[PDB]
Amino acid sequence: GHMQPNNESKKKAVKLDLDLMKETKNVCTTVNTKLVGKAKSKLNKLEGESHKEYVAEKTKEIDEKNKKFNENLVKIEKRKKIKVPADTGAEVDAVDDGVAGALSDLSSDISAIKTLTDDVSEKVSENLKDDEASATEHTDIKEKATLLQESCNGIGTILDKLAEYLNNDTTQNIKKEFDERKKNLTSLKTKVENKDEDYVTHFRDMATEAQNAVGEVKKAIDAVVAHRKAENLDVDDTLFSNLSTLLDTIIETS
């Protein structure tokens, strides 16, 4: 072994990195498609001629990032097939070292797509009247609530798979908390959809709930990062950094 402490630990570690990346990219692909849709749909709220430059440039960035994100899928789906165990030569798919940079791609494209769509949402607000702009906030609040729900569903699934590797009291507390909080935020997300309820305040509470739950998951991630580092197992802090920060970026709801 050069970077192989033990193959048993390898497959477990790889399973984590695979499930974590998998659920994250599943969320990202969903987020991208939903936000690209939202962005283009809200580009239809602008006057038109007045913002034709804006619509063009932003559509350009969308298409550029779509081709980039769509090739990145084919990139993050890559595995290196290695021989495990080394004796028999059994074919195992390992995520690969380059995937850290691949997450750096993803995180860049996804953070941009969000901020791009956020820009669109702002520009709608300035094209619209105070009343209509407030309805635009209502519109943001709904989609950002949805974005938060989307991310939290994925986050919970990641947490589940993560909690398998380091099934301990700590991950259980986090998972209990996350489950409670998940029921809470799912209820609040439903309240946020009704303008007759104070969707703004419900969003704020829901967001705070999410931050609590997410904070605990983030803490669980760190604990598992530390756990593998503690035994000199395959962990790249930078990989988890891109992951956790993109996690923060998707859950960050403008």
GROMACS .gro file of C-alpha atoms in nm:
model
  254
    1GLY     CA    1   0.000   0.000   0.000
    2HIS     CA    2   0.115   0.349  -0.081
    3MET     CA    3  -0.212   0.512   0.011
    4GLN     CA    4  -0.387   0.198   0.118
    5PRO     CA    5  -0.394   0.151   0.503
    6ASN     CA    6  -0.620  -0.150   0.463
    7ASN     CA    7  -0.863  -0.238   0.185
    8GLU     CA    8  -1.148  -0.289   0.429
    9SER     CA    9  -1.109   0.066   0.543
   10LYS     CA   10  -1.069   0.173   0.179
   11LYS     CA   11  -1.408   0.043   0.067
   12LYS     CA   12  -1.580   0.200   0.365
   13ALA     CA   13  -1.406   0.534   0.305
   14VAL     CA   14  -1.481   0.523  -0.066
   15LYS     CA   15  -1.844   0.437   0.012
   16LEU     CA   16  -1.865   0.758   0.215
   17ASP     CA   17  -1.703   0.975  -0.045
   18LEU     CA   18  -1.921   0.818  -0.312
   19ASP     CA   19  -2.249   0.858  -0.124
   20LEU     CA   20  -2.161   1.207  -0.011
   21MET     CA   21  -2.063   1.319  -0.359
   22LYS     CA   22  -2.355   1.132  -0.511
   23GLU     CA   23  -2.621   1.288  -0.293
   24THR     CA   24  -2.459   1.627  -0.322
   25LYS     CA   25  -2.441   1.612  -0.703
   26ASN     CA   26  -2.800   1.485  -0.712
   27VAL     CA   27  -2.902   1.795  -0.522
   28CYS     CA   28  -2.676   2.014  -0.742
   29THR     CA   29  -2.823   1.875  -1.067
   30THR     CA   30  -3.169   1.940  -0.932
   31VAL     CA   31  -3.077   2.288  -0.803
   32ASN     CA   32  -2.918   2.378  -1.134
   33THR     CA   33  -3.216   2.268  -1.339
   34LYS     CA   34  -3.464   2.437  -1.103
   35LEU     CA   35  -3.270   2.759  -1.073
   36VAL     CA   36  -3.196   2.773  -1.446
   37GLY     CA   37  -3.571   2.741  -1.496
   38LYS     CA   38  -3.646   3.004  -1.230
   39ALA     CA   39  -3.384   3.240  -1.370
   40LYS     CA   40  -3.512   3.216  -1.728
   41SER     CA   41  -3.870   3.246  -1.612
   42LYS     CA   42  -3.785   3.557  -1.415
   43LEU     CA   43  -3.590   3.702  -1.708
   44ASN     CA   44  -3.941   3.723  -1.855
   45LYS     CA   45  -4.033   3.968  -1.577
   46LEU     CA   46  -3.787   4.227  -1.697
   47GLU     CA   47  -3.900   4.499  -1.937
   48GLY     CA   48  -3.716   4.344  -2.224
   49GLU     CA   49  -3.538   4.601  -2.439
   50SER     CA   50  -3.413   4.784  -2.129
   51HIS     CA   51  -3.240   4.468  -2.005
   52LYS     CA   52  -3.174   4.285  -2.330
   53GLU     CA   53  -2.802   4.304  -2.263
   54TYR     CA   54  -2.859   4.159  -1.918
   55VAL     CA   55  -3.080   3.882  -2.043
   56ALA     CA   56  -2.828   3.797  -2.312
   57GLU     CA   57  -2.522   3.795  -2.084
   58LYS     CA   58  -2.698   3.598  -1.813
   59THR     CA   59  -2.832   3.346  -2.063
   60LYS     CA   60  -2.476   3.316  -2.196
   61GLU     CA   61  -2.348   3.237  -1.849
   62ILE     CA   62  -2.625   2.986  -1.801
   63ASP     CA   63  -2.544   2.808  -2.125
   64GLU     CA   64  -2.174   2.821  -2.057
   65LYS     CA   65  -2.226   2.680  -1.716
   66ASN     CA   66  -2.474   2.427  -1.840
   67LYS     CA   67  -2.225   2.286  -2.083
   68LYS     CA   68  -1.962   2.305  -1.806
   69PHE     CA   69  -2.184   2.151  -1.539
   70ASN     CA   70  -2.310   1.890  -1.785
   71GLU     CA   71  -1.954   1.786  -1.873
   72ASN     CA   72  -1.872   1.801  -1.500
   73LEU     CA   73  -2.138   1.533  -1.446
   74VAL     CA   74  -1.948   1.305  -1.677
   75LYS     CA   75  -1.643   1.410  -1.478
   76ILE     CA   76  -1.776   1.343  -1.128
   77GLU     CA   77  -1.924   1.016  -1.246
   78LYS     CA   78  -1.573   0.899  -1.317
   79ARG     CA   79  -1.414   0.640  -1.099
   80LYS     CA   80  -1.082   0.477  -1.119
   81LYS     CA   81  -1.111   0.109  -1.125
   82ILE     CA   82  -0.861  -0.042  -0.896
   83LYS     CA   83  -0.771  -0.387  -0.784
   84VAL     CA   84  -0.911  -0.468  -0.441
   85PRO     CA   85  -0.790  -0.689  -0.304
   86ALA     CA   86  -0.460  -0.652  -0.483
   87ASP     CA   87  -0.421  -1.029  -0.492
   88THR     CA   88  -0.731  -1.125  -0.681
   89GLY     CA   89  -0.757  -0.801  -0.871
   90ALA     CA   90  -1.125  -0.753  -0.809
   91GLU     CA   91  -1.253  -0.447  -0.985
   92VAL     CA   92  -1.362  -0.175  -0.751
   93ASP     CA   93  -1.454   0.176  -0.851
   94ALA     CA   94  -1.282   0.442  -0.652
   95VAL     CA   95  -1.389   0.804  -0.669
   96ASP     CA   96  -1.031   0.929  -0.758
   97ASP     CA   97  -0.812   1.216  -0.638
   98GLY     CA   98  -0.919   1.453  -0.920
   99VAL     CA   99  -1.271   1.464  -0.784
  100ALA     CA  100  -1.154   1.723  -0.528
  101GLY     CA  101  -1.093   1.959  -0.818
  102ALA     CA  102  -1.416   1.833  -0.972
  103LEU     CA  103  -1.599   1.955  -0.659
  104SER     CA  104  -1.417   2.282  -0.700
  105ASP     CA  105  -1.576   2.293  -1.050
  106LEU     CA  106  -1.920   2.203  -0.918
  107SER     CA  107  -1.907   2.440  -0.635
  108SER     CA  108  -1.803   2.715  -0.866
  109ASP     CA  109  -2.074   2.651  -1.122
  110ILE     CA  110  -2.346   2.595  -0.863
  111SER     CA  111  -2.251   2.901  -0.655
  112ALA     CA  112  -2.250   3.106  -0.975
  113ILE     CA  113  -2.584   2.966  -1.098
  114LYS     CA  114  -2.742   3.051  -0.764
  115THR     CA  115  -2.598   3.402  -0.750
  116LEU     CA  116  -2.693   3.446  -1.118
  117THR     CA  117  -3.052   3.351  -1.037
  118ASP     CA  118  -3.036   3.575  -0.728
  119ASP     CA  119  -2.925   3.863  -0.951
  120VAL     CA  120  -3.223   3.791  -1.173
  121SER     CA  121  -3.448   3.799  -0.866
  122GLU     CA  122  -3.300   4.137  -0.763
  123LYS     CA  123  -3.338   4.283  -1.109
  124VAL     CA  124  -3.702   4.173  -1.115
  125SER     CA  125  -3.748   4.360  -0.788
  126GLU     CA  126  -3.613   4.686  -0.938
  127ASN     CA  127  -3.820   4.644  -1.258
  128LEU     CA  128  -4.129   4.594  -1.057
  129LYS     CA  129  -4.319   4.834  -0.834
  130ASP     CA  130  -4.291   4.821  -0.451
  131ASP     CA  131  -4.602   4.604  -0.430
  132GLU     CA  132  -4.500   4.377  -0.711
  133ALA     CA  133  -4.140   4.364  -0.585
  134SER     CA  134  -4.281   4.252  -0.250
  135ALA     CA  135  -4.465   3.980  -0.445
  136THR     CA  136  -4.128   3.909  -0.598
  137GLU     CA  137  -3.991   3.862  -0.244
  138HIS     CA  138  -4.281   3.625  -0.187
  139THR     CA  139  -4.170   3.451  -0.506
  140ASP     CA  140  -3.804   3.437  -0.379
  141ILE     CA  141  -3.915   3.320  -0.040
  142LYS     CA  142  -4.109   3.032  -0.199
  143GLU     CA  143  -3.826   2.918  -0.427
  144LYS     CA  144  -3.556   2.973  -0.167
  145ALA     CA  145  -3.774   2.773   0.075
  146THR     CA  146  -3.790   2.506  -0.189
  147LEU     CA  147  -3.412   2.529  -0.239
  148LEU     CA  148  -3.366   2.490   0.134
  149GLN     CA  149  -3.597   2.188   0.140
  150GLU     CA  150  -3.416   2.033  -0.159
  151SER     CA  151  -3.081   2.076   0.002
  152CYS     CA  152  -3.202   1.958   0.345
  153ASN     CA  153  -3.351   1.638   0.194
  154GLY     CA  154  -3.017   1.564   0.036
  155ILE     CA  155  -2.828   1.670   0.350
  156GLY     CA  156  -3.036   1.429   0.555
  157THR     CA  157  -2.955   1.147   0.318
  158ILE     CA  158  -2.587   1.231   0.333
  159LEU     CA  159  -2.616   1.238   0.711
  160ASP     CA  160  -2.774   0.889   0.701
  161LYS     CA  161  -2.490   0.745   0.495
  162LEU     CA  162  -2.231   0.934   0.696
  163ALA     CA  163  -2.381   0.807   1.022
  164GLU     CA  164  -2.319   0.453   0.899
  165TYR     CA  165  -1.948   0.495   0.897
  166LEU     CA  166  -1.934   0.665   1.225
  167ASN     CA  167  -2.242   0.532   1.396
  168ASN     CA  168  -2.185   0.679   1.741
  169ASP     CA  169  -2.377   0.877   2.006
  170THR     CA  170  -2.269   1.197   1.844
  171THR     CA  171  -2.412   1.113   1.501
  172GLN     CA  172  -2.729   0.981   1.666
  173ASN     CA  173  -2.783   1.313   1.850
  174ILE     CA  174  -2.731   1.494   1.527
  175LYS     CA  175  -2.962   1.263   1.336
  176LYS     CA  176  -3.236   1.293   1.604
  177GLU     CA  177  -3.201   1.665   1.600
  178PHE     CA  178  -3.191   1.674   1.222
  179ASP     CA  179  -3.505   1.459   1.204
  180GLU     CA  180  -3.692   1.681   1.445
  181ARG     CA  181  -3.571   1.987   1.269
  182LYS     CA  182  -3.655   1.832   0.932
  183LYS     CA  183  -4.017   1.778   1.040
  184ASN     CA  184  -4.015   2.138   1.161
  185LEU     CA  185  -3.873   2.285   0.842
  186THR     CA  186  -4.101   2.072   0.625
  187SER     CA  187  -4.398   2.208   0.818
  188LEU     CA  188  -4.264   2.564   0.795
  189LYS     CA  189  -4.189   2.520   0.421
  190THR     CA  190  -4.555   2.443   0.377
  191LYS     CA  191  -4.654   2.756   0.575
  192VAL     CA  192  -4.418   2.965   0.362
  193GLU     CA  193  -4.619   2.865   0.057
  194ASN     CA  194  -4.927   3.041   0.187
  195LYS     CA  195  -4.907   3.423   0.154
  196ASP     CA  196  -5.179   3.442   0.414
  197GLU     CA  197  -4.939   3.311   0.672
  198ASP     CA  198  -4.636   3.520   0.743
  199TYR     CA  199  -4.423   3.343   0.492
  200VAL     CA  200  -4.133   3.582   0.550
  201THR     CA  201  -4.115   3.506   0.923
  202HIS     CA  202  -4.179   3.133   0.864
  203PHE     CA  203  -3.894   3.137   0.614
  204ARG     CA  204  -3.665   3.303   0.867
  205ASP     CA  205  -3.756   3.047   1.135
  206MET     CA  206  -3.724   2.761   0.886
  207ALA     CA  207  -3.386   2.895   0.775
  208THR     CA  208  -3.272   2.916   1.136
  209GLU     CA  209  -3.403   2.561   1.195
  210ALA     CA  210  -3.211   2.450   0.889
  211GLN     CA  211  -2.894   2.625   1.013
  212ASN     CA  212  -2.923   2.432   1.339
  213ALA     CA  213  -2.970   2.099   1.165
  214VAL     CA  214  -2.711   2.177   0.902
  215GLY     CA  215  -2.470   2.296   1.167
  216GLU     CA  216  -2.500   1.960   1.336
  217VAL     CA  217  -2.449   1.774   1.004
  218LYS     CA  218  -2.151   1.997   0.929
  219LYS     CA  219  -2.019   1.904   1.273
  220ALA     CA  220  -2.082   1.533   1.191
  221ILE     CA  221  -1.891   1.573   0.864
  222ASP     CA  222  -1.600   1.727   1.053
  223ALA     CA  223  -1.615   1.448   1.307
  224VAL     CA  224  -1.593   1.184   1.034
  225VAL     CA  225  -1.318   1.381   0.851
  226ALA     CA  226  -1.130   1.387   1.178
  227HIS     CA  227  -1.212   1.019   1.237
  228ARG     CA  228  -1.050   0.910   0.912
  229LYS     CA  229  -0.758   1.158   0.952
  230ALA     CA  230  -0.712   1.017   1.303
  231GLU     CA  231  -0.632   0.680   1.156
  232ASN     CA  232  -0.449   0.813   0.843
  233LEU     CA  233  -0.723   0.705   0.608
  234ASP     CA  234  -0.801   0.866   0.274
  235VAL     CA  235  -0.939   1.203   0.357
  236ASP     CA  236  -0.878   1.518   0.172
  237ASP     CA  237  -0.975   1.817   0.386
  238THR     CA  238  -0.998   2.030   0.074
  239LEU     CA  239  -1.255   1.789  -0.079
  240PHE     CA  240  -1.470   1.818   0.233
  241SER     CA  241  -1.405   2.190   0.242
  242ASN     CA  242  -1.546   2.232  -0.111
  243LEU     CA  243  -1.828   2.007  -0.019
  244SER     CA  244  -1.913   2.174   0.311
  245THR     CA  245  -1.879   2.521   0.170
  246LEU     CA  246  -2.097   2.435  -0.129
  247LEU     CA  247  -2.335   2.285   0.122
  248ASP     CA  248  -2.333   2.627   0.291
  249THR     CA  249  -2.370   2.795  -0.045
  250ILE     CA  250  -2.678   2.595  -0.151
  251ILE     CA  251  -2.835   2.631   0.192
  252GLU     CA  252  -2.755   3.003   0.186
  253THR     CA  253  -3.073   3.149   0.075
  254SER     CA  254  -3.063   3.502  -0.053
   0.00000   0.00000   0.00000
